[PDB]
Scaffold this active site. Sequence first.
Site, PDB file in Angstrom:
ATOM      1  N   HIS B  41     -20.628  10.493 -42.309  1.00 44.11           N
ATOM      2  CA  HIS B  41     -20.177   9.566 -41.272  1.00 44.11           C
ATOM      3  C   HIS B  41     -20.394   8.107 -41.663  1.00 44.11           C
ATOM      4  CE1 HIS B  41     -24.091   8.282 -39.791  1.00 44.11           C
ATOM      5  NE2 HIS B  41     -24.474   9.529 -39.579  1.00 44.11           N
ATOM      6  N   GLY B 143     -30.068   2.887 -38.392  1.00 46.38           N
ATOM      7  CA  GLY B 143     -30.155   2.726 -39.829  1.00 46.38           C
ATOM      8  C   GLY B 143     -30.967   3.773 -40.562  1.00 46.38           C
ATOM      9  N   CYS B 145     -30.279   7.022 -40.750  1.00 42.35           N
ATOM     10  CA  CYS B 145     -29.509   8.148 -41.255  1.00 42.35           C
ATOM     11  C   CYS B 145     -29.605   8.217 -42.769  1.00 42.35           C
ATOM     12  CB  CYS B 145     -28.059   8.039 -40.813  1.00 42.35           C
ATOM     13  SG  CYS B 145     -27.887   8.475 -39.085  1.00 42.35           S
TER      14      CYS B 145
HETATM   15  C1  LIG Z   1     -27.590   6.871 -38.422  1.00 44.77           C
HETATM   16  O1  LIG Z   1     -28.428   5.816 -38.903  1.00 44.77           O
HETATM   17  C2  LIG Z   1     -27.714   7.021 -36.902  1.00 44.77           C
HETATM   18  C3  LIG Z   1     -29.091   7.538 -36.508  1.00 44.77           C
HETATM   19  C4  LIG Z   1     -29.479   7.352 -35.042  1.00 44.77           C
HETATM   20  C5  LIG Z   1     -30.882   7.911 -34.796  1.00 44.77           C
HETATM   21  C6  LIG Z   1     -29.401   5.892 -34.617  1.00 44.77           C
HETATM   22  N1  LIG Z   1     -26.686   7.966 -36.488  1.00 44.77           N
HETATM   23  C7  LIG Z   1     -25.688   7.645 -35.669  1.00 44.77           C
HETATM   24  O2  LIG Z   1     -25.501   6.503 -35.287  1.00 44.77           O
HETATM   25  C8  LIG Z   1     -24.829   8.809 -35.244  1.00 44.77           C
HETATM   26  C9  LIG Z   1     -23.465   8.855 -35.919  1.00 44.77           C
HETATM   27  C10 LIG Z   1     -22.652  10.073 -35.472  1.00 44.77           C
HETATM   28  C11 LIG Z   1     -21.223  10.007 -36.017  1.00 44.77           C
HETATM   29  C12 LIG Z   1     -23.295  11.403 -35.858  1.00 44.77           C
HETATM   30  N2  LIG Z   1     -24.647   8.845 -33.787  1.00 44.77           N
HETATM   31  C13 LIG Z   1     -25.646   9.176 -32.975  1.00 44.77           C
HETATM   32  O3  LIG Z   1     -26.711   9.606 -33.367  1.00 44.77           O
HETATM   33  C14 LIG Z   1     -25.403   8.992 -31.520  1.00 44.77           C
HETATM   34  C15 LIG Z   1     -26.471   8.096 -30.899  1.00 44.77           C
HETATM   35  C16 LIG Z   1     -26.491   6.665 -31.416  1.00 44.77           C
HETATM   36  C17 LIG Z   1     -25.367   5.836 -30.824  1.00 44.77           C
HETATM   37  C18 LIG Z   1     -27.854   6.048 -31.095  1.00 44.77           C
HETATM   38  N3  LIG Z   1     -25.520  10.268 -30.840  1.00 44.77           N
HETATM   39  C19 LIG Z   1     -24.504  11.065 -30.543  1.00 44.77           C
HETATM   40  O4  LIG Z   1     -23.342  10.853 -30.847  1.00 44.77           O
HETATM   41  O5  LIG Z   1     -24.863  12.274 -29.820  1.00 44.77           O
HETATM   42  C20 LIG Z   1     -23.881  13.097 -29.195  1.00 44.77           C
HETATM   43  C21 LIG Z   1     -23.497  12.578 -27.826  1.00 44.77           C
HETATM   44  C22 LIG Z   1     -22.693  11.450 -27.698  1.00 44.77           C
HETATM   45  C23 LIG Z   1     -22.339  10.988 -26.434  1.00 44.77           C
HETATM   46  C24 LIG Z   1     -22.789  11.651 -25.297  1.00 44.77           C
HETATM   47  C25 LIG Z   1     -23.593  12.778 -25.423  1.00 44.77           C
HETATM   48  C26 LIG Z   1     -23.945  13.239 -26.688  1.00 44.77           C
END
Ligand SMILES: *[C@H](O)[C@H](CC(C)C)NC(=O)[C@H](CC(C)C)NC(=O)[C@H](CC(C)C)NC(=O)OCc1ccccc1
EC number: 3.4.19.12
Lengths: 302, 305
Positions: B41, B143, B145
């Site tokens: 991703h 950050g 990931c």
């Molecule tokens: C990478 O550094 C980062 C790690 C997190 C711990 C911040 N990963 C992401 O940003 C990740 C990318 C996606 C394409 C897998 N997204 C998420 O982890 C995201 C939460 C972020 C915005 C803090 N979570 C997510 O998409 O969970 C599923 C979901 C989404 C919306 C509603 C319910 C569940």
Amino acid sequence: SGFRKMAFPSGKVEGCMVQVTCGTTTLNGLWLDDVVYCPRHVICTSEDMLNPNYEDLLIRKSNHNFLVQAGNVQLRVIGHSMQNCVLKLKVDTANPKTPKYKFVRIQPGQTFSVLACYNGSPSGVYQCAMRPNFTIKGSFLNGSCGSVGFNIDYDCVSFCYMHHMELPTGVHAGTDLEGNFYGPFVDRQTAQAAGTDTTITVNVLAWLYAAVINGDRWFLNRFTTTLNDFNLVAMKYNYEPLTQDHVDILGPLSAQTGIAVLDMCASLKELLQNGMNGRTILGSALLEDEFTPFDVVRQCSG
Amino acid sequence: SGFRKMAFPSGKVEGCMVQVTCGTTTLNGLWLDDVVYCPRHVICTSEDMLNPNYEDLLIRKSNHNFLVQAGNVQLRVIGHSMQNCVLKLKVDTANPKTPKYKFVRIQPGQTFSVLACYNGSPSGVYQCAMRPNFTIKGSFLNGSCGSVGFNIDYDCVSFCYMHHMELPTGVHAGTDLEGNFYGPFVDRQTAQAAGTDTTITVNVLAWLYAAVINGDRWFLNRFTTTLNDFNLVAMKYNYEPLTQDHVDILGPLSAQTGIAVLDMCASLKELLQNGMNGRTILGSALLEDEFTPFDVVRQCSGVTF
Ligand SMILES: *[C@H](O)[C@H](CC(C)C)NC(=O)[C@H](CC(C)C)NC(=O)[C@H](CC(C)C)NC(=O)OCc1ccccc1
Ligand SMILES: *[C@H](O)[C@H](CC(C)C)NC(=O)[C@H](CC(C)C)NC(=O)[C@H](CC(C)C)NC(=O)OCc1ccccc1
Ligand SMILES: [Cl-]
Ligand code: NA
């Protein structure tokens, strides 16, 4: 999100660990530049564990009496000196893996990472705190002496602890890297005991702020307290006094959560009075006191 | 004496971490031999992260789109491919710090060390368990990931986890190093949720053995039980079944402490039905389930790497 007991990455310290043997005693040493640091009791024999005269023992040693091994290489000792309770062995080769480093003596309540080692090799890494009674609650076996505690804020390793002994309650005592013991202890096997331990109040409050930052509010209440009233209650639970310095230190976490420090103190008062009634905070059923305010900020904001 | 949540020494892994940038996204990669592994991703966008066609998203990509930095040194990407949910960037230089390693997929209840990294720089290390619901209870910020989990076996690093996402309850999900998710999760910002979790029974038993080895004995009792009888109680309290293989794995701790597994199960049975009566075990008021039997033997016997 999330909140864990997190240690610093240990690689910079791993590259400094060596094995030191004198007579029949083996323990760990810390190899920085051309000096190996280790506990001076490596020069004790079975006969002088109660009242060793370390000056008299050391003057009798030849450089070749010290066997220092770094991985598969024997290091050559070319001199030695004693600084308080630490022995400094000069070797003929500087450690090419020496990191940027400093020595710092810490205050009770401070946290650090421990790299537990045996025979110069690492077994694992964990987080500790200097307890108010100047012990640490480590995990150490025979041969662990010379293992060190450290922090690595930024790219510089701050060495703050060297392991020397275990006391009867199973807790541990040691020195800074200038060889001065934390607390009243001595590197003699004469009877010694840790004082009654107490809880590090400022760290508990930091952790409660961590819990709020991570989305938990169940323990908050509508009350506040004076500082003196808080300390009169907390002392009844063997909590350490909260000083105005500590209140100042908690200011940033207060600002980030919108919860005044003395309001959080009233939460802690209630938790001490009530317990958790089957609930948890950040995955714990006890109040945690081995995260500092600095640790919470580092882990929650970065 | 003493018993701590203890991570593996992380030095061998620290030498493998790099920073990977694609467009406006920066995260971590794992540099082994002449390949950098990272979450796929990394190629997604602010306007492209809800229902991505990774397959189609990668062909538009080219080598110099991926900026890989090992410390302050750029690595040249000379190829790229996708394997499940992991991106493989071929670079023109083999990592001179590559340790002896392999890729492994772990089972629920197994523990490992996480090296949390940001911008390619290791920041902390902690011990985790693969939960029965295939999440981990980690500590990760934006950050993070591409941070990885691992075990060490003698001199060999076994990489088992790469971090991809956070779920709404604040728990974390990721893949093995072949890009297969642990658990029924997908690398899309679509609605997903952690399933109901359960407690890892064999690990609780191992931690009770650690307590006995450290002189905490109050919970021991005269009683024994059967695998069948205990497993009904376990089911009742949302504890994972105890298999005969678990019993055998605990055998060493059984022989050294004098407390047979079903003898200790009877202790655990009573702790479940009655609680701890206000007491603690190894400094915890909860039953701890993130130490495996192997973890207890390693720590209590001083195994080194
Ligand atoms: C990478 O550094 C980062 C790690 C997190 C711990 C911040 N990963 C992401 O940003 C990740 C990318 C996606 C394409 C897998 N997204 C998420 O982890 C995201 C939460 C972020 C915005 C803090 N979570 C997510 O998409 O969970 C599923 C979901 C989404 C919306 C509603 C319910 C569940
Ligand atoms: C070094 O590897 C080792 C680490 C321990 C964790 C085993 N340290 C020692 O052996 C140390 C050497 C002395 C000269 C400083 N001794 C102790 O730590 C000793 C306990 C050992 C024998 C298990 N503790 C001790 O003597 O404490 C003082 C004491 C004496 C008698 C009664 C109460 C307290
Ligand atoms: Cl019985
Ligand atoms: Na029993």
